[PDB]
Design a protein around this ligand. Sequence first.
Ligand code: JMM
Ligand code: CL
Ligand code: CL
Ligand code: CL
Ligand code: CL
Ligand code: CL
Length: 345
Amino acid sequence: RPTFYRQELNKTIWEVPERYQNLSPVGSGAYGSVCAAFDTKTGHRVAVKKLSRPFQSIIHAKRTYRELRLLKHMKHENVIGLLDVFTPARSLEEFNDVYLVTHLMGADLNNIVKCQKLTDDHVQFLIYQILRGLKYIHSADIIHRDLKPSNLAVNEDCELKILDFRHTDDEMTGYVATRWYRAPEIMLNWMHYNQTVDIWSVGCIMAELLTGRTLFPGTDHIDQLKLILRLVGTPGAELLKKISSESARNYIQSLAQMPKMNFANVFIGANPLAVDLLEKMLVLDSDKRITAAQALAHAYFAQYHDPDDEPVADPYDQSFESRDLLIDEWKSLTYDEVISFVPPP
Ligand SMILES: O=C(c1ccco1)N1CCN(C(=O)C2CC2)CC1
Ligand SMILES: [Cl-]
Ligand SMILES: [Cl-]
Ligand SMILES: [Cl-]
Ligand SMILES: [Cl-]
Ligand SMILES: [Cl-]
């Protein structure tokens, strides 16, 4: 057991191992209770997160367990990983607080996309890295569900990682970036969705890196659907059959039919190979979208593609998701995952 020390950070008593020095808050509350620190064991600048109210309800206790299981699994160059997890508790009986430690990057994609001139080579390398990380995430049967520029971290060499492993009705309402990258089948609860929702999001991100502009900046759910159908066309009878929501199917049929637009006339002057890949990602029927594994072999990525260095994940057991347990049973499972942590090489 390391020696712990105490200090007051943001109205809060933090108790951390001596290896972590110079703690100072970051994110202005956006990430939760998170501080930058210097890690004296590794020499890295790190992020230390102190969970708030981790075991306050059955729902909160299960969310704590889910977050720690996902972060312990993810071991890939293009995905956030866990450097450490600790508690100052010396037994299950006195366990209350959980702290998570990760690498901390320089900025998110929103900072670069808003403030930089991006070449076609920059767009090739950034989207290649998102797809390499997604091939790994999807191989474990994990769905991200929230890919957007604020969840993609980058360092000065243009190397990228995927963040955020919840959302409320109020959070998805009106003129908000929280909804602009969502696939239409999840935005409007059309059907049981699957991993194809993440490829819609990558298409929206790619289009914005190419133009400097949000692809579908809707003022509300209905305005955003009208922007999507003007580009990709209204649904045909095959996709309408698959909308298992009757009232959603009825509303779609009230709209005048529109053909798919010419993407070379929308993305004026872009690499033809980028236009081709956008046409394969931004397909209304999720069964017909390109997968991450197929997209890595597309000619747009010929400069970066290496089929011997695009790894897949170990198997991930998510059977706990269908399990009904008491608060103390979720808290005991979380404790065992804290004490069993093995740090990376
Ligand atoms: O690198 C970044 C970053 C840079 C720009 C936006 O996010 N992050 C912050 C959020 N993180 C956490 O809160 C981890 C639980 C510690 C660590 C990774
Ligand atoms: Cl220490
Ligand atoms: Cl990492
Ligand atoms: Cl504790
Ligand atoms: Cl964003
Ligand atoms: Cl597992």
